[PDB]
Ligand binder design. Sequence first.
Ligand code: BTN
Ligand code: BTN
Ligand code: BTN
Ligand code: BTN
Lengths: 122, 122, 122, 122
Amino acid sequence: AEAGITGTWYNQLGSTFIVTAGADGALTGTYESAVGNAESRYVLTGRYDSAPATDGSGTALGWTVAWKNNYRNAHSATTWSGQYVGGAEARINTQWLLTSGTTEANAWKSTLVGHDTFTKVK
Amino acid sequence: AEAGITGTWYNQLGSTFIVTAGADGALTGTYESAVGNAESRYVLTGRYDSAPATDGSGTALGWTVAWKNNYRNAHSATTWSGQYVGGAEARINTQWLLTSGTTEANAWKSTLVGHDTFTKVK
Amino acid sequence: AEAGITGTWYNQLGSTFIVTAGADGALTGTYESAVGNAESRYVLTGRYDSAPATDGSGTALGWTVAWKNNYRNAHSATTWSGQYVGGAEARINTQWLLTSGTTEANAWKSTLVGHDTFTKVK
Amino acid sequence: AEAGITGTWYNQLGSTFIVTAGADGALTGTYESAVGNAESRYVLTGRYDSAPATDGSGTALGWTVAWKNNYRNAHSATTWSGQYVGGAEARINTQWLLTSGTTEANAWKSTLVGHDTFTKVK
Ligand SMILES: O=C(O)CCCC[C@@H]1SC[C@@H]2NC(=O)N[C@@H]21
Ligand SMILES: O=C(O)CCCC[C@@H]1SC[C@@H]2NC(=O)N[C@@H]21
Ligand SMILES: O=C(O)CCCC[C@@H]1SC[C@@H]2NC(=O)N[C@@H]21
Ligand SMILES: O=C(O)CCCC[C@@H]1SC[C@@H]2NC(=O)N[C@@H]21
């Protein structure tokens, strides 16, 4: 939790996420996607369990990114739900949901699901 | 977007979520789950597309809740990814991922997936 | 389980699914999607818990459809995982994953996730 | 497609899946989970795109397993949706939904979501 989450992480797609975990569960930072209709950095906000468990369990967290910045607007948002595992080789394992804004008719195909693993090394 | 999202919403489980959408894509508020290991209100933070599309598409958004407050700590976090549809009958349709902090061994079963529909009326 | 699953079901999109549940957990039938790149009927196969629980719980089941038939080939497959609830108003509540065949590069966006509710009445 | 899918695959959890892909899109075989409330082999059935795309894309497929056999009954079912990539290092990348049969009240927590990568070598 806290101390260990803050920093720069990289996932297998080459995206970068920089976060600051605050004392009381908040997560703030920027995300730069290596793929998709995105350019540069986007703002992210989230929450994490600041009082994780005796035991060697992971810390649960989640964050969101709306794919709109000053360069592009993809009219979509991604939320990543996962857990942080610290240690020699700390990682954040997640599953994500990417929803695009659609018309009611195309709503059945509005969401992509995937998973990303983030490490401190890339 | 913006104006229309702010307020109190209720989903089919009887949970309540109160949010304020800010001018530049931020979402802030509290969530009270009617089910699960939760008691009272939890803080939520998220993001939404403040510049949605000509067209009648939904606005994409997402938010997170870490299930830790002053009463309980479930060591879990939920992220909801969906879109807001305004109108006579405005709703927010979402899919969610609820991750619990586990030991590496039980990580395969760390995440629940579901969907919630929120309305302004309950 | 068994007896009760067999028949024609309809979901909220207007798709039709006809299945036969066999004595030992098998599910067979055809699916006709009302949306997407599909035309006519596609073959489906799956499995269900033939020995469900004392109790009023649902029966777990799942099935798959590859979107290739004699009219079209969408190079995709959908799997529905859910449970059957019998009674006056029997329904099958599910969550589905629709994966399209992509090049390694676009694999992160290969899967859509959604949910469908099927009833015996449409 | 076809020829290349048939065989024994192993995923990162140590589970084994043996399948036979039939000429016209069917998948049949057995699954042995290394984790969970399962013992020995379970029957699986599924479908795959027998006429995949010029191009180097993956073949879409999906299969289901109901966790009931002669030794145990977990009253649950898993469906895996993913794609097969052949080559020197062929793999099947998937995302899965595991639904347990619950009472209507606990249905919101009836489904786990995860991802598995299968290889021909373990
Ligand atoms: O195309 C879009 O809608 C905007 C970019 C989405 C990029 C996604 S979010 C999940 C996956 N992980 C990443 O780092 N990037 C892609
Ligand atoms: O049990 C827990 O881990 C904490 C409560 C989780 C409640 C979930 S989040 C999704 C679903 N929608 C709700 O409003 N509540 C449940
Ligand atoms: O476009 C395709 O790839 C083929 C059709 C997919 C239709 C999907 S599967 C889930 C949802 N429920 C339906 O009945 N149809 C759509
Ligand atoms: O506990 C159960 O309900 C039965 C076993 C479920 C095992 C799951 S399915 C997905 C994941 N991949 C595996 O090979 N095993 C676990």
